[PDB]
Paper text:
Here, we used cellular and biophysical methods to investigate the molecular interaction between the G9C8 TCR and the native insulin B chain 10-mer peptide, 15LYLVCGERGF24 (G9GF) and 9-mer peptide, 15LYLVCGERG23 (G9G) as well as a heteroclitic form of the peptide, LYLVCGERV (G9V), presented by H-2Kd. We solved the atomic structures of each of the peptides in complex with H-2Kd, demonstrating the peptide residues that interact with the MHC binding groove and identifying the solvent-exposed residues that are most likely to contact the TCR. We show that insulin reactivity by a CD8+ T-cell clone, known to induce type 1 diabetes, is characterized by weak T-cell antigen receptor binding to a relatively unstable peptide-MHC. H-2Kd is unusual compared with the binding motif for most other mouse alleles (that have an anchor at position 5 and the C terminus) in that it anchors at positions 2 and the C terminus, reminiscent of most human peptide-MHC binding motifs.
H-2Kd·G9G crystallized in space group P1, and H-2Kd·G9V crystallized in two distinct space groups, P1 and P1 21 1 (only the P1 data set is shown here in detail), which showed identical features (data not shown). The G9G and G9V structures featured unambiguous density around the peptides, which were presented in an extended conformation, primarily anchored at peptide residues 2 and 9, with Cys-5 acting as a secondary anchor in the center of the peptide and residues 6–8 extending away from the groove. The solvent-exposed nature of peptide residues 1, 4, 6, and 7 in the H-2Kd·G9G and G9V structures (and possibly the G9GF structure) makes them the most likely TCR contact residues, supported by our previous data showing that modifications at peptide residues 1, 4, 6 (residue 6 could affect the conformation of residue 7), and 8 reduced T-cell recognition and could act as antagonists. G9G made 17 vdWs and 4 HBs, and G9V made 21 vdWs and 4 HBs, both through peptide residue 9. Although G9G only lost four vdW contacts with anchor residue Gly-9 compared with G9V (anchor residue Val-9), there were knock-on effects at the N terminus of the peptide. The first 5 residues of G9V made 102 vdWs and 12 HBs with the MHC binding groove, whereas the first 5 residues of G9G only made 102 vdWs and 9 HBs. These observations demonstrate the importance of optimal anchoring at both the N and C terminus of the peptide and help explain the substantially lower thermal stability of the G9G and G9GF peptides compared with G9V. The G9C8 TCR bound to the non-native H-2Kd·G9V with a comparatively strong affinity (KD = 13.6 μm). This was in contrast to the weaker binding affinity to the native G9GF and G9G peptides (KD ∼113 and ∼286 μm, respectively), mirroring the effect on TCR affinity by altering peptide anchor residues reported before. Surprisingly, despite a weak monomeric affinity for the G9C8 TCR, H-2Kd·G9G tetramers could still robustly identify cognate T-cells.
Numbering used by the authors:
A (entry chain B): 0 to 99
B (entry chain C): 1 to 9
C (entry chain A): 0 to 276
Write the structure that this text describes.
């Protein structure tokens, strides 16, 4: 067996403009095995109705998924992606940075 | 076109 | 324009005691997903995942559904067999993956046929690129190799990879031509990020492009070498297009000397960009 740990990118579909509607994405890749729990968070709270792509995998057999939700960014609200996987002993949290 | 596997493992 | 690929990515995960394995199959043409099957759907069917696939009629969906269901049982059985081969506990969950399909050149010659498997994240067995012989990753897979050489399965797979795989790829590219044979050129811009009194970051963005293949470079005056540029992996936007960025750290006040160059099939020539105050 080889287990691989999820690698995570958090980003918006379009360049963020405060008060303008957009999509928030959490792209989780490079993991094995495929069971995984992913939440998008707004100020620490689980966002409802987040959708995800169909499970697929890369050339090295590692899995990938896109989690996403419609959102409206604001100056003060903090968004993040929180991931739990068998390779981790506590969740990984990646904050959304609008410049990345 | 999905192709079914033949002999098992 | 150029080469294409038809790929299926199939995952089966045992769930002993919690009943039957999770079986999921997904199909892609080039960078675009076009079908799925998932055993856990309340009525599991092979289904379209690109709008242009709704052009295939009911016979296609029924046939494909049946094929998925046959492999569902193939994997049920093969998962139990691998558990015995490796002398693992009967209670644990394990994963088999299978990848198969064809890569073609622009004149439709087969560049490579694939039919390949992994178990618990490592290679198990693979049809070699000759489409005639098998490469086992370990001694458990040697038992499979012998059974498949005895069965002559290589020839069944080769006939698919050289024939039907290519014929159906062609069909799908025709059904989905408006999107699969399109290009979307990147929309690009440079951002400026203050840091210290000695340094700033310039980030060169490419957004909304299809296909996923892209290359970004930075140049200082003439060019760039022995370089410490930061790059992210190319990522899906969620709307069928992709994103990428590449960043450099430069001296305060020298930002105008750096240029970003974006290379993509959709552009008539490479795009050159600067930071625009």
């Amino acid at each position: 067996m080889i287990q691989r740990t999820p690698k995570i990118q958090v980003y918006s579909r379009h360049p963020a403009e405060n008060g303008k509607s957009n999509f928030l994405n959490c792209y989780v890749s490079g993991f094995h095995p495929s069971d995984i729990e992913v939440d998008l968070l707004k100020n620490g709270e689980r966002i409802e109705k987040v959708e995800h792509s169909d499970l697929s995998f890369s050339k090295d057999w590692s899995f990938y998924l896109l989690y996403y939700t419609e959102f409206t960014p604001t100056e003060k609200d903090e968004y993040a992606c929180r991931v739990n996987h068998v390779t981790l002993s506590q969740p990984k949290i990646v904050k959304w940075d609008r410049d990345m | 076109l999905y192709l079914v596997c033949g002999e098992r493992v | 324009m150029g080469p294409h690929s038809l790929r299926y990515f199939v995952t089966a995960v045992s769930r002993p005691g919690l009943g039957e394995p999770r079986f999921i199959a997904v199909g892609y043409v080039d960078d675009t997903q076009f079908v799925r099957f998932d055993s856990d759907a309340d009525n599991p069917r092979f289904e379209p995942r690109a709008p242009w696939m709704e052009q295939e009629g009911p016979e296609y969906w029924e046939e494909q559904t049946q094929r998925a269901k046959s492999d569902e049982q193939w994997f049920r059985v093969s998962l139990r067999t691998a558990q015995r081969y490796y002398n693992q506990s009967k209670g644990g969950s394990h994963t088999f993956q299978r990848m198969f399909g064809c890569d073609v050149g622009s004149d439709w010659r087969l560049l490579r046929g694939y039919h390949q498997f992994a178990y618990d994240g490592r290679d198990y067995i693979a049809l070699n690129e000759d489409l005639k012989t098998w490469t086992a990753a370990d001694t458990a897979a040697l038992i499979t190799r012998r059974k498949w050489e005895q069965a002559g399965d290589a020839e069944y797979y080769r006939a698919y990879l050289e024939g039907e795989c290519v014929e159906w790829l062609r069909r799908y590219l025709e059904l989905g031509n408006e999107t699969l044979l399109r290009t979307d050129s990147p929309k690009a811009h440079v951002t400026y990020h203050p840091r210290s009194q000695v340094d700033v970051t310039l980030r060169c963005w490419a957004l909304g492009f299809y296909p996923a293949d892209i290359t970004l470079t930075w140049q200082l005056n003439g060019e760039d070498l022995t370089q410490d540029m930061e790059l992210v992996e190319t990522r899906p936007a969620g709307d069928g297009t992709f994103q990428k960025w590449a960043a450099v750290v430069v001296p305060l006040g020298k930002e105008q000397n750096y240029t970003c160059h974006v290379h993509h099939k959709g552009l008539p020539e490479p795009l050159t960009l600067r930071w625009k105050p």
